[PDB]
Subunit: 340 residues, 4 copies
């Protein structure tokens, strides 16, 4: 029996990537797509690259409940929370931030909406490499942000084994344009962004409390992250360069990373002194981690690269769906990066 999958907000870039992934997934099929703007059209009329002849639906919760086992939501902040209340017997994988936070007061501070009744929702942060045991039994998964995915994966072995000083962590992060999310104003025009790099939302970015939640959970201690994102003139990819103090040797750390990720099919620890290129990830669910030590100041440099649209969004969402349905976690995700 094929998992029956629905996508709300199917015409955004993360929706398109769920379409690609689910079409290829040998144990799932698309039974529902919705869009407000394009309701009534075949998805391939809007995006011929999708090769998807399915008509876009105007969202109706009874139709979803009848036609879907699982539903991916890619919607403006707060919309998934509201629409999910009406559904019956459908597992939810939300690509936004509505279900990411353990404490709904933090979501409210950063996203400006109260999540009434949160205490009744069995939700989990969808990072399989940290939470697969809980994801297995979840009804609602809050799919991680793209920067948090890159960062938490970069830091987990270090924090789990207290190999670094987690009190202050510096994160200088570089993302292709698709990683800033749905943004159609002047600053995201080709002519503005092309051939230019810029910092944005320096130190106050909604991803910070999210990273901190997960990093603090691992370490057992409050983690304050200093976070600077930069918009890079390429479509996709994230490189997070992470700086933290340590009194350990690079060798001990590298062994610890190897050990931690040895059975994780999507995370690849590089040899010491080899640093990741973002395009090594292109189109795939794979993550590459490299590291260096600055010896004079005892500063560990961790470098993690992911494809923000895949392991940073829709690939990880499918990964979560596999876990929730008890499938081999690489199902529909067994393919390699596209290069060059």
């Amino acid at each position: 029996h094929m998992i029956r999958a629905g996508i709300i907000g199917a015409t955004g870039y993360t929706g398109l990537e769920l379409v690609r992934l689910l079409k290829n997934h040998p144990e799932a099929k698309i039974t529902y797509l919705s869009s407000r703007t394009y309701a009534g059209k075949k998805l391939e009329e809007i995006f011929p690259s999708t090769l998807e002849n399915s008509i876009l639906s105007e969202f109706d919760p009874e139709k979803v409940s009848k036609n879907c086992d699982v539903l991916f939501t890619a919607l403006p902040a707060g919309a998934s929370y509201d629409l999910v209340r009406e559904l019956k017997g459908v597992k939810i994988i939300d690509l936004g931030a509505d279900f990411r936070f353990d404490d709904p007061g933090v979501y409210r501070e950063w996203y400006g909406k109260e999540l009434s009744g949160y205490e009744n929702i069995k939700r989990v942060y969808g990072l399989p490499e940290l939470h697969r045991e809980e994801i297995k039994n979840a009804q609602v998964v809050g799919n991680p942000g793209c920067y948090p995915t890159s960062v938490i994966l970069a830091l987990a072995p270090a924090l789990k084994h207290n190999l670094v000083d987690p009190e202050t962590i510096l994160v200088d992060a570089k993302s292709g344009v698709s990683g800033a999310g749905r943004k159609e104003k002047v600053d995201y025009l080709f002519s503005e962004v092309n051939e230019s790099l810029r910092p944005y939302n320096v130190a106050k970015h909604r991803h910070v409390p999210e990273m901190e939640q997960e990093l603090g959970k691992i370490s057992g201690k409050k983690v304050n992250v200093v976070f600077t994102p930069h918009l890079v003139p390429m479509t996709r990819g994230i490189l997070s360069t992470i700086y933290v103090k340590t009194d350990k040797s690079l060798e001990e750390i590298h062994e610890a990373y190897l050990e931690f990720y040895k059975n994780e099919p999507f995370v690849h620890v590089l040899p010491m002194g080899i640093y990741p290129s973002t395009k090594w990830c292109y189109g795939s669910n794979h993550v590459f981690i490299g590291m260096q030590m600055e010896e004079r100041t005892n500063t560990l440099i961790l470098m993690s690269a992911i494809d923000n649209l895949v392991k940073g969004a829709s690939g990880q969402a499918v990964q979560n769906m596999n876990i929730m349905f008890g499938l081999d976690e690489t199902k529909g995700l067994e393919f390699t990066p596209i290069y060059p």
Copy 2:
């Protein structure tokens, strides 16, 4: 499982063969060679591949032993030479050594004599035109990337006598991966567009060969390629005179391709973007008419590394081993 080897696994077409073949449900990589990087695992050179096979130094005895089929991506003429040394291995050459029906034409444009050619059971590997002959071929001459785009763009028009085949103008645009010396450096190519090899490109006689077979009349092509600052994709803008209506031609295109899983004729008024093909074996074709001059404008887009090279190579293999033509190739373009 089909046992597949790749000679020249560290070129871009090689890397895409590796991607496609790893994912192929009825085939597996049993051999990989590299003149430059032998003795290293493929993923040491190109981590993106995630392939731990050590790269071999080419040895025909090992190939004959381990491979049912061999993909070759070499300097011109080299595939011709190494294929003599092999026996009982099917060959799909990504180069030009086996493309031409008349080896005199190859000689003229590639400056090498192909001895004993008439004794080689070879075929031009464009499945949408020659799948019945590829089925029984021992050696396939995998089409070049511009010809793939041009021939697919013009096939219905020429088959159905809907245009004047006499003179066809082809203005083509390729990303860099499909056209390294100092001129192919990032700072040189970036943020610039240039024509190259104008009306003197080795793909021209290749096009004329295939286009004339379809037409049943002589075709002269005027061909201008242009280097575009992006990594991949081809768009061929084709101009030809016609006395037929656009509606007529469009209906003909839909009919011609109706059962072809990799060619997609767009709705009238809609023009292809090259990135609509990205990473996939799929082709999009659009058209317009300039009505005052009775000029049909055909536009086709392909990913030059996939349908333009390695995907077509895999498609050809499927045909040769009696597999469903789309095996290993079903997946859709990546976007954006």
Copy 3:
């Protein structure tokens, strides 16, 4: 006499390039700037790159008439025409199409507005390499479109000397995105354009009748242009590839081209066998032309490259300003392309 220059629509990309040129121009200075979107803001608050602290005005004809000897206008279609009636004693160089056409019925057909009173206006098409003699004494110049500038410069010697068959000319052109301007439509978003090439407006583009007008005048014959533009994933630059039948040799045509442009400072006929790269023009008012013959069909291929924002727009405008005020035509335009 520093020439006093006003710019209407200072915050579009052609307006920005006018500011860069005119700040550097030794015999002109900016005395008026207006903007419909950003009036009341300093230009450098919108575009810090401009390094221009002047406050952007809300357009007022009295102030223009008072403070300017010349006025560049970059407005939507029809707008420059309307405002020009309300003005006196000011030369006008319109970057749009309102004054480009000899026949206002052709303009109406393609741009949809009626230009009443047109035959009282002494306007001239501002292509200096063809019309500098008339531009000298004009009060209103319709500054050519960017694709026309490339195409006419590519064809002029051939048509003037009857070296080709001008009845049917096929033009396959390629432009960077900046041709579109700073218009926030989703198609012009970085993520949509990047890494892709697309034809657009095939055989139905407003520049066609404008090309045909100028090409007809210099051939003395009716010219039908078949024109396919393509959007290229780069910011600036136009390459026009032009196909025309000829009974002459390439050697004779090359000879005629060299002779025709021998004394034009901005047009550079390349060596035979050499083709232009668009970036060779970057930031400058210079043009490169190459050519080839396809001998079996007697098809001449002409290739011309310009920077669309400079010789294709604001640079050509300043060149026309120099001509109109009797200055050395290269003034403020002496700089060479920036490379790489």
Copy 4:
């Protein structure tokens, strides 16, 4: 009219020197040499230069004859060597030969002992810090591109004791222009990568200049990244502070108020690299992470102009008593 020679005219820094000197009202090119293309017209190699001059095979007699000032763009150590065998010529070295005060630092990092160094009147060619010394130099080590961005970002903070100078972290991003198979278009396009992490030759150069300004030892952690664009450097700098962001911004406005090429942006506004494009201008922004008291400074330059050839011309102007902006007055090309 100053007579300028360029040794190494077919590199990118050479090409920008040609464009800038051609436009310079009070200088002119009297010598062009190329180790690679000697014998050919410059425009046979780069048609965009519009330069029909034939490239010379370097002859120090013809140089001594024909130039007041020479710009050198050669492989490291290469001049030094020919510099000493010249006289009556101002030298602006675009390489690292003359940047270092301690030539032992140069030899450990660049692998070459510089004998006779101590009696050469050389200076570090950063006008915004050293113009008075540059005024009377006969040799300038033109600063590397990354140090240029990093030092201008930090100068007011270090000068006015506004930050803990003890440990400074620099995460730098550069366009490709800032050779082999991995510099090919298809390799670099649509990809970002760190390189030379922790171990980069520009680190000792920064620590030299930052220490001078603070009057206290400065340790720099520096990590560069290759960005898929042609030009532009963005340096993102992290440093602990006990001062308010407001006070730091005021100090930056004061320190740079009379500096024509350095522009401190309003608070909240961060620089785009393309805002500098083709120009000698610098943009600085900043923010505070309040919980940790971490200052984030951000500077953007054009690596080929203020990072290389434009700073060089700025230095020529100073050496010859010209307005520092001569030939450099033009604004960024945008978009």
